[PDB]
Amino acid sequence: GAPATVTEQGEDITSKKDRGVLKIVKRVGNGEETPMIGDKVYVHYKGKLSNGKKFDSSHDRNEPFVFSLGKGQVIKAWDIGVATMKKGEICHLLCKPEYAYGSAGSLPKIPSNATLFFEIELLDFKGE
Numbered sequence: 001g002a003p004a005t006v007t008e009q010g011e012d013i014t015s016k017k018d019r020g021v022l023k024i025v026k027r028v029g030n031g032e033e034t035p036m037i038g039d040k041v042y043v044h045y046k047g048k049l050s051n052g053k054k055f056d057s058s059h060d061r062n063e064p065f066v067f068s069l070g071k072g073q074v075i076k077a078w079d080i081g082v083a084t085m086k087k088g089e090i091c092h093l094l095c096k097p098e099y100a101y102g103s104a105g106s107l108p109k110i111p112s113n114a115t116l117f118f119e120i121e122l123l124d125f126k127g128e
């Protein structure tokens with residue numbers, strides 16, 4: 001399935017090249033511009049654990065998830081991954097725990113040492 005495919009066929013987008021964050025572009029977005037640090041970014045996403053369980057979805061809430069890019073408001077994999085996206089892009093990200101919730105996990109849904117899969121759509125980005 002998609003998690004296996006990004007695990008085996010994804011591109012390492014980390015600066016360390018430690019394969020901690022792998023990406024596949026699923027839908028090519030618009031133009032060449034990616035967001036800049038501090039931009040307000042609007043995304044839709046769904047996340048799955050490596051046991052196949054969906055643990056979150058913005059679609060199911062009928063509202064996007066909004067954060068300021070590159071400020072540690074989200075897991076490291078998201079700051080790194082969303083920074084690579086164009087407006088309108090959909091990607092898959094495979095996130096090792098060192099770029100996610102680490103040994104701590106995140107109760108109630110994310111266990112210790114969890115590799116996470118996300119589908120992310122970059123809806124918009126704007127400077128404030």
Ligand SMILES: COc1ccc(OCCN2CC[C@H]3CCC[C@@H](C2=O)N3S(=O)(=O)c2ccc3[nH]c(=O)sc3c2)cc1OC
Nearest residue numbers: 047055056072073074075076078100101106107108109110
């Ligand atoms: C700078 O370092 C950090 C900053 C913020 C962090 O977490 C708060 C931000 N945040 C939650 C929003 C959401 C979308 C954005 C990505 C991610 C997220 O970052 N989660 S998520 O889908 O993985 C997700 C969803 C439901 C859910 N239910 C649970 O019981 S656990 C859980 C996890 C953690 C950081 O380092 C550990």
